[PDB]
Design an enzyme around this catalytic site. Structure first.
Site, PDB file in Angstrom:
ATOM      1  N   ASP A 141    -100.710  58.402 124.618  1.00 47.51           N
ATOM      2  CA  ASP A 141    -100.130  57.067 124.715  1.00 47.51           C
ATOM      3  C   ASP A 141     -99.616  56.616 123.349  1.00 47.51           C
ATOM      4  O   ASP A 141    -100.376  56.059 122.546  1.00 47.51           O
ATOM      5  CB  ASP A 141    -101.166  56.095 125.277  1.00 47.51           C
ATOM      6  N   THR A 142     -98.311  56.816 123.102  1.00 47.62           N
ATOM      7  CA  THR A 142     -97.697  56.368 121.845  1.00 47.62           C
ATOM      8  C   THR A 142     -97.668  54.853 121.715  1.00 47.62           C
ATOM      9  O   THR A 142     -97.509  54.340 120.600  1.00 47.62           O
ATOM     10  CB  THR A 142     -96.275  56.929 121.704  1.00 47.62           C
ATOM     11  N   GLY A 143     -97.827  54.125 122.811  1.00 45.92           N
ATOM     12  CA  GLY A 143     -97.876  52.683 122.744  1.00 45.92           C
ATOM     13  C   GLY A 143     -99.252  52.105 122.511  1.00 45.92           C
ATOM     14  O   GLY A 143     -99.415  50.883 122.513  1.00 45.92           O
TER      15      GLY A 143
HETATM   16  C1  LIG Z   1     -96.731  50.575 135.420  1.00 44.58           C
HETATM   17  O1  LIG Z   1     -95.809  50.207 134.426  1.00 44.58           O
HETATM   18  C2  LIG Z   1     -96.395  49.733 133.241  1.00 44.58           C
HETATM   19  C3  LIG Z   1     -97.771  49.538 133.161  1.00 44.58           C
HETATM   20  C4  LIG Z   1     -98.337  49.068 131.987  1.00 44.58           C
HETATM   21  C5  LIG Z   1     -97.534  48.782 130.895  1.00 44.58           C
HETATM   22  C6  LIG Z   1     -98.158  48.262 129.605  1.00 44.58           C
HETATM   23  N1  LIG Z   1     -98.898  49.324 128.947  1.00 44.58           N
HETATM   24  C7  LIG Z   1     -98.438  50.461 128.515  1.00 44.58           C
HETATM   25  C8  LIG Z   1     -99.620  51.077 127.400  1.00 44.58           C
HETATM   26  O2  LIG Z   1     -99.483  52.512 127.252  1.00 44.58           O
HETATM   27  C9  LIG Z   1    -100.710  50.775 127.852  1.00 44.58           C
HETATM   28  C10 LIG Z   1    -101.293  51.930 128.693  1.00 44.58           C
HETATM   29  C11 LIG Z   1    -101.623  51.621 130.154  1.00 44.58           C
HETATM   30  C12 LIG Z   1    -100.636  51.664 131.124  1.00 44.58           C
HETATM   31  C13 LIG Z   1    -100.950  51.393 132.447  1.00 44.58           C
HETATM   32  C14 LIG Z   1    -102.250  51.089 132.797  1.00 44.58           C
HETATM   33  F1  LIG Z   1    -102.565  50.824 134.096  1.00 44.58           F
HETATM   34  C15 LIG Z   1    -103.233  51.059 131.828  1.00 44.58           C
HETATM   35  C16 LIG Z   1    -102.924  51.340 130.513  1.00 44.58           C
HETATM   36  C17 LIG Z   1    -101.650  50.450 126.572  1.00 44.58           C
HETATM   37  C18 LIG Z   1    -102.872  51.078 126.376  1.00 44.58           C
HETATM   38  C19 LIG Z   1    -103.635  50.768 125.260  1.00 44.58           C
HETATM   39  C20 LIG Z   1    -103.153  49.832 124.358  1.00 44.58           C
HETATM   40  S1  LIG Z   1    -104.095  49.393 122.887  1.00 44.58           S
HETATM   41  C21 LIG Z   1    -105.324  48.124 123.308  1.00 44.58           C
HETATM   42  O3  LIG Z   1    -104.683  50.565 122.236  1.00 44.58           O
HETATM   43  O4  LIG Z   1    -103.195  48.937 121.828  1.00 44.58           O
HETATM   44  C22 LIG Z   1    -101.937  49.206 124.550  1.00 44.58           C
HETATM   45  C23 LIG Z   1    -101.184  49.518 125.665  1.00 44.58           C
HETATM   46  C24 LIG Z   1    -100.418  49.337 128.616  1.00 44.58           C
HETATM   47  O5  LIG Z   1    -101.195  48.462 128.828  1.00 44.58           O
HETATM   48  C25 LIG Z   1     -96.166  48.966 130.969  1.00 44.58           C
HETATM   49  C26 LIG Z   1     -95.599  49.442 132.141  1.00 44.58           C
END
Ligand SMILES: COc1ccc(CN2C[C@H](O)[C@@](Cc3ccc(F)cc3)(c3ccc(S(C)(=O)=O)cc3)C2=O)cc1
Lengths: 99, 99
Positions: free
Chosen positions: B25-27
């Site tokens: 997960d790059t995000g």
């Molecule tokens: C279906 O379509 C979507 C769904 C969600 C998003 C927003 N997303 C993308 C981030 O990959 C994520 C990972 C994640 C995705 C789906 C999910 F069910 C659970 C987790 C994430 C993880 C960790 C962190 S953290 C606290 O480490 O900074 C930040 C973000 C997130 O919440 C966009 C589109």
């Protein structure tokens, strides 16, 4: 380009005639943009992630220029804390992970 | 390996003697794992994302084997819907984005 991950992989995008910065997000199925002025019709939608669910507006066939590569697809708009380019658009610009 | 993004970039990991699947997960700034049995002390922490915030337990110097590459670092454990390998560990296995 090749992008290492010591910093957030932010890129400049152009969408709807506007310039934004967005995160290349391999963990996002969908592309989700902060509240912004997009033209056209839409369909309400819910998306989930860490910490719960949010309601977004779903726009289809939206043109985005992502770091100079053009892509067309679905863009969601709503209360996200960061602009997210998800896999639906990452595949269109030929983005891969490499290790 | 090189990984395209037409599907979720899931990899097999080994952590705490247990086998799990996790999303590259790059995000994600941080690595966040579903509720699981990790040994040792910790520190409470809050993380935010789409849809709000969650409380997690922060473990430092945790060994993870990520698709056969070893990494040591901080792992958060808590109510995430999916196991997430974030940038704190992705840099350790030499992961890049390419387009
Ligand atoms: C279906 O379509 C979507 C769904 C969600 C998003 C927003 N997303 C993308 C981030 O990959 C994520 C990972 C994640 C995705 C789906 C999910 F069910 C659970 C987790 C994430 C993880 C960790 C962190 S953290 C606290 O480490 O900074 C930040 C973000 C997130 O919440 C966009 C589109």
């Amino acid at each position: 380009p090749q992008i290492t991950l010591w910093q957030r992989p932010l890129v400049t995008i152009k969408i709807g005639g506007q310039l934004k910065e967005a995160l290349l997000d391999t963990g996002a199925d969908d592309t989700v943009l902060e509240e912004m002025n997009l033209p056209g019709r839409w369909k309400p939608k819910m998306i989930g992630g860490i910490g719960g669910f949010i309601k977004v507006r779903q726009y289809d066939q939206i043109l985005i220029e992502i770091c100079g590569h053009k892509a067309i697809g679905t863009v969601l708009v709503g209360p996200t804390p960061v602009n997210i380019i998800g896999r639906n658009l990452l595949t269109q610009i030929g983005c891969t992970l490499n290790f």
